[PDB]
Amino acid sequence: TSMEVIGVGFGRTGTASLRDALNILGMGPTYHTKEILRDPARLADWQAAVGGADVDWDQVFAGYRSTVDWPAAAFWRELVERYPEAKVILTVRDPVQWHRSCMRTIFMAYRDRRFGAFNEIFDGVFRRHFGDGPIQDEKYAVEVFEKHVRDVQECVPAERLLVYRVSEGWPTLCKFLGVGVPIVAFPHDNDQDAF
Ligand SMILES: Nc1ncnc2c1ncn2[C@@H]1O[C@H](COP(=O)(O)O)[C@@H](OP(=O)(O)O)[C@H]1O
């Protein structure tokens, strides 16, 4: 299928831990914003995609077998259609807790030089969900978060979708993917030192 797992949850829903877990389970290498922080030239792919280019997703994800997090979650419909055999994982969270975490981290802007273009490109990524509305407004952002959960559940067949909280750890994830439960601890990446 080329793609094993497409994570379509928003950032700050445990996506770094899910990345690590998919990697442990042999479903990786797993794309994540971390890959763009390691190689900022990858920003060009997402800048093109946000701008309406006919993206070659096999080139965007060359070298990777799964993806989680933004930016790819802002293209979730495209990717579910492009990779119909991939399993889809929607990570969820209390949406109020989610937004409060975002305001301290990835949405801080809404109140090295290799990342000069990062904020403008990711503004385009986020606004594929938020539109021109107020990202910083908790009531609005909760509505966007809840709409996305409904949209995913209405679009992806239930047998191909896992609605997942990372606090569940291995058992539900591994049952969904059809693999055994690892001995190693389930990841708990707080995803804080990038800030
Ligand atoms: N195994 C786990 N159990 C519970 N929460 C977890 C977890 N792994 C990660 N998280 C939480 O998921 C959030 C990070 O999500 P992401 O990797 O998408 O940025 C962090 O919470 P906070 O957002 O409250 O700090 C982190 O503590």
Pairing mode, strands 66-67 and 30-31: parallel
Cβ–ligand 1 contact at 186 (below 6 Å):
yes
* Three-class DSSP category at 52: coil
Cβ–ligand 1 contact at 20 (below 6 Å):
no
Instruction: For the beta carbon of residue 123, count every other beta carbon within 10 angstroms.
Output: 14
- Return d(Cα 188, Cα 18) in angstroms, integer: 9
Rounded to the nearest angstrom, the distance between the alpha carbon of 159 and the centre of ligand 1 is 26
- Could you identify the residue written with the tokens 């070659």? 56
- Could you identify the residue written with the tokens 């809840």? 146
* Three-class DSSP category at 95: helix
- Return d(Cα 42, Cα 45) in angstroms, integer: 6
Cβ–ligand 1 contact at 189 (below 6 Å):
yes
> In the chain, what is the straight-line distance between the N-terminal and C-terminal CA atoms, in Å?
35
Alpha helices in the chain, H assignment, sequence order: 15-24, 33-38, 43-50, 57-60, 76-82, 95-104, 118-130, 138-155, 170-177
- Return d(Cα 30, Cα 4) in angstroms, integer: 10
Pairing mode, strands 5-7 and 30-31: unpaired
Cβ–ligand 1 contact at 102 (below 6 Å):
no
List the domains of the chain with CATH numbers: 5-177 (3.40.50.300)
The atom number, within ligand 1, closest to the CA of 17 reads 8
What does this entry list as its resolution, in Å? 1.6
Cβ–ligand 1 contact at 17 (below 6 Å):
yes
8 A C-beta contact, residue 2 and residue 155: no
Sequence-ordered list of residues with C-beta below 8 angstroms from that of 110, at least 6 positions apart, any chain: 103, 134, 135, 136
8 A C-beta contact, residue 56 and residue 40: no
Which of 12, 68, 96 for mutating ligand 1's site (highest number of atoms within 8 Å of CB)? 12
Q: Name the DSSP class of 149.
A: H
